Amino acid sequence: EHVFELVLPKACMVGHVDFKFVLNSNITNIPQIQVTLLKNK
C-alpha cells in the first residue's frame, strides 16, 4: 500500500484528479493495483 496525502492551496470545486503513471518497461504483466480517492479527516 501507498498513500499520497494531497493538500490543495485553497478550497475549490474539484472536477477530477489526473493520476498519471509510468510502469517499468521490463513489465511482463499488467499489475493488479487499485487506486482510490478519499477525503482527509
From Swiss-Prot:
Domain notes: The BIR domain is essential for its anti-apoptotic function and is important for binding to DIABLO/SMAC and caspases.
Similarity comment: family membership: Belongs to the BIRC6 family.
Subcellular location: Golgi apparatus, trans-Golgi network membrane; Endosome; Cytoplasm, Cytoskeleton, Spindle pole; Cytoplasm, Cytoskeleton, Microtubule organizing center, Centrosome
Source organism of this protein record: Homo sapiens (Human)
Function text: Anti-apoptotic protein known as inhibitor of apoptosis (IAP) which can regulate cell death by controlling caspases and by acting as an E3 ubiquitin-protein ligase. Unlike most IAPs, does not contain a RING domain and it is not a RING-type E3 ligase. Instead acts as a dual E2/E3 enzyme that combines ubiquitin conjugating (E2) and ubiquitin ligase (E3) activities in a single polypeptide. Ubiquitination is mediated by a non-canonical E1 ubiquitin activating enzyme UBA6.
Subunit note: Homodimer; antiparallel. Interacts with RNF41. Interacts with DIABLO/SMAC, likely with higher affinity to SMAC dimer than SMAC monomer; this interaction blocks the substrate-binding site and inhibits the caspase inhibition activity of BIRC6. Interacts with KIF23/MKLP1, USP8/UBPY, BIRC5/survivin, MAP2K1/MEK1, RAB8A/RAB8, RAB11A/RAB11, PLK1, EXOC3/SEC6 and EXOC4/SEC8.
Expression by tissue: Expressed in brain cancer cells.
Modifications after synthesis and translation: Ubiquitinated; mediated by RNF41 E3 ligase and leads to proteasomal degradation, impairing inhibition of apoptosis. Deubiquitinated by USP8/UBPY. Autoubiquitinated; mediated by E1 ubiquitin activating enzyme UBA6.
Entire-sequence positions represented here: 1088 to 1128 of 4857
Name of the featured protein: Dual E2 ubiquitin-conjugating enzyme/E3 ubiquitin-protein ligase BIRC6
